[PDB]
Design a protein around this ligand. Structure first.
Ligand SMILES: *[C@@H]1O[C@H](CO[C@@H]2O[C@@H](C)[C@@H](O)[C@@H](O)[C@@H]2O)[C@@H](O[C@@H]2O[C@H](CO)[C@@H](O)[C@H](O)[C@H]2NC(C)=O)[C@H](O)[C@H]1NC(C)=O
Lengths: 223, 215, 196
């Protein structure tokens, strides 16, 4: 089977360089043109660059021309993307894609095998652990509560409730990127209105990049 | 660049339904349109390769047709593993361009959102900022509009939204909106209100609180 | 093994041909290649192969074969060949210096010229920089001589294509010719197109 394993991604300053790698297996590498396709968080597919089997022909999208360079190494069965002068718009998941037709030409083809992605995040923010704040429930059958995971960088954060024991009715939302460059997400659960006070709810927040673990108890408001 | 458009942007269907998705180019791309499928969190998989050709392993129900500028992707009998987002891609010229995608989700009875509003925690107010959170829980369909009113004065540009994927069990959606103000600005106003508009609501519903009071 | 014929019959005998700037590229794979249909002179005005001799094509085997189809003026056939410098070779259809394949052309005064004028065939005469071989520029974007966003009806904002306009009673070189370029690839892959 054909395998497109991708590596290189990380967090990089605006203006910095970064190199990407894609190690292939399962087909004669030199017979197929290779492609890079990136997908910004929450958005569609955006083609970036191609290189023919020879490496004789390369083409780049206008957004990356002049600062990205694509190459391949026949002996290492690997594809590369050297990125320079990076900028926040370049923040996307970068896929390694294989043309299905074994040709030394580049057009009129499809992408039959895609690798799973290496994440590139271009930001000037420094690594920061989240602050976890309680969303205390208020005073009709069911009640809603949760915690707010605010001002952390970079992605991701995992949230659980009661060390994994509370799962039904949990809704952990995708994080949003604030103007400050730090992410915020909320995690909520719906619990019976009769269980408050006697039953305790703890939300377990983990942010491995800052290596931060917070267990926060969401208690009803004192009022 | 050749502009790829897809119609509709969203589609709700049930298992066994026939589904038809349109993709159109701003230029003749002959027959070089590809169709890809992408489930959340995973890489695109190729389905159709030259407008009509089915990729090996793709179930027989998928089919495409069209030439020039008008193209269509058809699923004869919808299946549970066919609920994903579908993109089209032209290979006639470089740079290659994709369609915006069409999301196909599970049809479900029109369910209105249950709304909750959360005043900022006193622990956060000490830190110097205020986050007011509005929750739309277990509603269908995803089309929902949130409106933030502060002392009946209407806010824009200071709120952010987030929506979960369709639930595996009840096929509903959930939305959170965060209204972020400085502590000083938050101290200046009394009524904080969240206005929710949804197809399952006959009238827009509002959840509000007065800063300094309970609940 | 494979008993399939290649669609050479449906490329040369194609009902209508495209303009050179939008030249068509058809893949050929998994058949048997009968080139006997091409050795018909008094039909093909030009038949010149580079990297092979036309007389010994039925003995050979290739990874894929590519057939390019377009229409150019008779005087422009001469520059569909490696190392040429005309408008068509610079801006419409470029062949590699190391080209391995055959260029076939035949006169189409009959089918592509009218007493009124056949302007349905276009060619690109303005472009920022030449084409790499086997590139294909299909854009129709107003052209400024100094590379800037060009929004006509402003000045110095000009259109890149031009119609040939073929007439029935005109010079021999001004008549339309239909061209097919055959490209042979020979990859690290098994050969799927062979002779009898
Ligand atoms: C080989 O080619 C000749 C020539 O084709 C004719 O002239 C060409 C320039 C082009 O205009 C063709 O469409 C013409 O048909 C073919 O001989 C022709 O045969 C037809 C009868 O079918 C006759 O009316 C023409 O006058 C003939 N022309 C000549 C010059 O002899 C011949 O059929 C071709 N053979 C094969 C196997 O394709």
């Amino acid at each position: 089977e054909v395998q497109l394993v991708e590596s290189g991604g990380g967090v990089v300053q605006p203006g910095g360089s970064l190199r990407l790698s894609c190690a292939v297996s399962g087909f004669t590498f030199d017979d197929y043109a290779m492609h890079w396709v990136r997908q910004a968080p929450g958005k569609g597919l955006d083609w970036v660059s191609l290189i023919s089997g020879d490496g004789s022909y390369t083409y780049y999208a206008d957004s990356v021309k002049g600062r990205f360079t694509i190459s391949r190494d026949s002996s290492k069965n690997s594809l590369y993307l050297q990125m320079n002068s990076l900028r926040t718009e370049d923040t996307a998941l970068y896929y390694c894609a294989k043309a299905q037709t074994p040709t030394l030409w580049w057009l009129q083809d499809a992408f039959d095998i895609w690798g799973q992605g290496t994440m590139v995040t271009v930001s000037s923010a420094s690594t920061k652990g989240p602050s976890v704040f309680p969303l205390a429930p208020s005073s009709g059958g069911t009640a809603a509560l949760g915690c707010l995971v605010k001002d952390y960088f970079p992605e991701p954060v995992t949230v659980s409730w009661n060390s994994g024991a509370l799962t039904s009715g949990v809704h952990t939302f995708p994080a949003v990127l604030q103007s400050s460059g730090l992410y915020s997400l909320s995690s909520v659960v719906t619990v019976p209105s009769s269980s408050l006070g006697t039953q305790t709810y703890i939300c377990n927040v983990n942010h491995k990049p800052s290596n931060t673990k917070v267990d926060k108890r969401v208690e009803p408001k004192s009022c | 660049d050749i502009q790829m458009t897809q119609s509709p942007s969203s589609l709700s269907a049930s298992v066994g339904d026939r589904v038809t998705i349109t993709c159109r180019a701003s230029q003749s791309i002959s027959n070089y349109l590809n169709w890809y499928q992408q489930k959340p969190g995973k890489a695109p998989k190729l389905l159709i390769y030259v407008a009509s050709s089915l990729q090996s392993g793709v179930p027989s129900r998928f089919s495409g047709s069209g030439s020039g500028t008008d193209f269509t992707l058809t699923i004869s009998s919808l299946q549970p593993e066919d609920f994903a987002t579908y993109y089209c891609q032209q290979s006639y010229s470089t740079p290659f361009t994709f369609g915006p995608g069409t999301k196909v989700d599970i049809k479900r009875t029109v369910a209105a959102p249950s709304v909750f509003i959360f005043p900022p925690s006193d622990e956060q107010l000490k830190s110097g900022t205020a986050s007011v959170v509005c929750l739309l829980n277990n509603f269908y369909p995803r089309e929902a509009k949130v409106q933030w009113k502060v002392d009946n004065a209407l806010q824009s540009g200071n709120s952010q939204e987030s929506v979960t994927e369709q639930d595996s069990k009840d096929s509903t959606y959930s939305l959170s909106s965060t209204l972020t103000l400085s502590k000083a600005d938050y101290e200046k106003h009394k009524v904080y209100a969240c206005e929710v508009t949804h197809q399952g609501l006959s009238s827009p519903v509002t959840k509000s609180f007065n800063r300094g009071e309970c609940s | 093994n494979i008993t399939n014929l290649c669609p050479f019959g449906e490329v040369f005998n194609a009902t209508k041909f495209p303009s050179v700037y939008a030249w068509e590229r058809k893949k050929i794979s998994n058949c048997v290649a009968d080139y006997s249909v091409l050795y018909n002179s008094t039909f093909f005005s030009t038949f010149k192969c580079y990297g092979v001799s036309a007389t010994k094509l039925n003995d050979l085997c290739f990874s894929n074969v590519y057939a390019d189809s377009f229409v150019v003026k008779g005087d422009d056939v001469r520059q569909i060949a490696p190392g040429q410098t005309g408008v068509i070779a610079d801006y419409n259809y470029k062949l590699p210096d190391d080209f391995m394949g055959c260029v076939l052309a035949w006169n189409t005064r009959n089918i592509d010229a009218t007493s009124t004028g056949n302007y349905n065939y276009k060619y690109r005469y303005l472009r920022h920089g030449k084409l790499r071989p086997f590139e294909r520029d299909i854009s129709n974007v107003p052209f400024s001589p100094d590379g800037k966003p060009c929004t006509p009806p402003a000045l110095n904002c000009y259109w890149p294509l031009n119609d040939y306009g073929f007439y029935t009673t005109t010079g021999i070189g001004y008549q339309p010719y239909r061209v097919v370029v055959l490209s042979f690839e020979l990859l690290n892959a098994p050969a799927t197109v062979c002779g009898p």
